[PDB]
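Co-fold these.
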Amino acid sequence: QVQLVESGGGVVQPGRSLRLSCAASGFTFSVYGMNWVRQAPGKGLEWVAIIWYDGDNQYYADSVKGRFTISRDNSKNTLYLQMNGLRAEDTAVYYCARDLRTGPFDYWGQGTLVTVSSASTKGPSVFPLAPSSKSTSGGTAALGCLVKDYFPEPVTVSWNSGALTSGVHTFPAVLQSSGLYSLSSVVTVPSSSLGTQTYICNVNHKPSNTKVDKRVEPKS
Amino acid sequence: VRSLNCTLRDSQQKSLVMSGPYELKALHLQGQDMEQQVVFSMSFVQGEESNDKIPVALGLKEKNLYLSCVLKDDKPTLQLESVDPKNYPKKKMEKRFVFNKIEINNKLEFESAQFPNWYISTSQAENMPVFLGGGGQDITDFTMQFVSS
Amino acid sequence: EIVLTQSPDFQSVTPKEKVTITCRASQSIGSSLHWYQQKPDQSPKLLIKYASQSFSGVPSRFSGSGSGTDFTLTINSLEAEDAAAYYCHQSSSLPFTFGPGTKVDIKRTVAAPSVFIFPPSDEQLKSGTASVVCLLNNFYPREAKVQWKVDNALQSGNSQESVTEQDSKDSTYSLSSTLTLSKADYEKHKVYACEVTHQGLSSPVTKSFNRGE
Ligand SMILES: [Cl-]
Ligand SMILES: [Cl-]
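Predicted complex below.
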């Protein structure tokens, strides 16, 4: 079957360069046009570049024109993207895609994340989002964990080591002014469970090897 | 203007494909790669109905392009020209886009109506561009297959 | 360059509904308009090629139509798995362009958000910065308005919102609004409130706290 596999994404400093690869199988690679399409976090798809079947021609979007170079190697069934002058705006998941007759993008790869930042690897600070003293009898209380200032993505959050799953909402990360990520994980629980049940958020940031188990208690 | 959607293969069974923004190349394709063939919209234009000749225009059905013939350095040249798809096909098509479709030896020949004795041609060699040519070693004969898919 | 626009930006659909979304081109593109589906943190997939032609393996419920500048994608009886972003793309001329997309979600009964406000912890402000989190929990539709009040004064450019993806069970959204202030700025004021406006609320809901009270 048609298979496209991208590799080469990672964290890169702005102004520096990075090479993306896309290995193809299950079709005559030498007779199909190939493309790169990118998607910045929470944004629409953006076409980056095309290379015709034989590699004697290519075309770029204005946004990448001059900074990026699309190429291929038909003997290795591989598609390339050389990125130069990378900037914060270039942070995106990069997909490789085959086109049919220079028309639709009929097969897509899984995508590779390219992170463009001057930020250093950092484990997060974990603060409690304490359940309110106003939480009434037979009602619900919300509590959580503010996971702040980490780089790069991802951090993972579980509650009571994954024992508590119903009512949990771990929010997608938001990039702050500083160039660091922040998110909160919340859980709603019975207000009557606050004294008898222990609530611990388990935060894990592998890039910095930061494991934090934070107890979330009513304030006194 | 009513036209017919088709693919064209030269007399050596080489298929036609896009290789650039305004370029076609002719190469042999494996059976499973038959879908790669460029889709033409052949329209019948108002003109010279001489015995064995029929005036046609060749648009690319999936692009805002038409084949046209012009001169470059005193030389008749084939090109793919950008058009506004909403105004095409025209019954009164512009002279540059007009080809005389000739039926001979159960085959098709496309002569430029702008340049007599100049035809849509391919080379014997694999993966070379489609051009205006026509002694000589250029291939000028084609077969038309209908688009079903 | 050919620009593509998509309408609406967001669509709420009850499962089994026949739904239609549009794509408009800035210039005539013949039938060279393609439709893609994209689920969050998933690779896009081709649905319809050349306006109205089927693509192998795509469920028969997906249908496309249109020519020139106006194009439509029809979902003939929406299924739960169809909540996704829908993109159109044109290949008539270079450079190739995508439309901005249509996000389709699952319609359910209006659900008011459960609002909670969280002051900054003692351990946070020790390191110099204070965070005020406003939680809107389990609401429908996605549309919610959050305004921060600091001693009955409206705040601007110091808050970041985050919204979860639609829950696969209850079809609700949850949202966090995080007000960031320096330790000093936070120590200058007493009242911190977040006002929430949603279709499920007859009158907007305010959740407040007096700093250290
Ligand atoms: Cl073939
Ligand atoms: Cl179906």
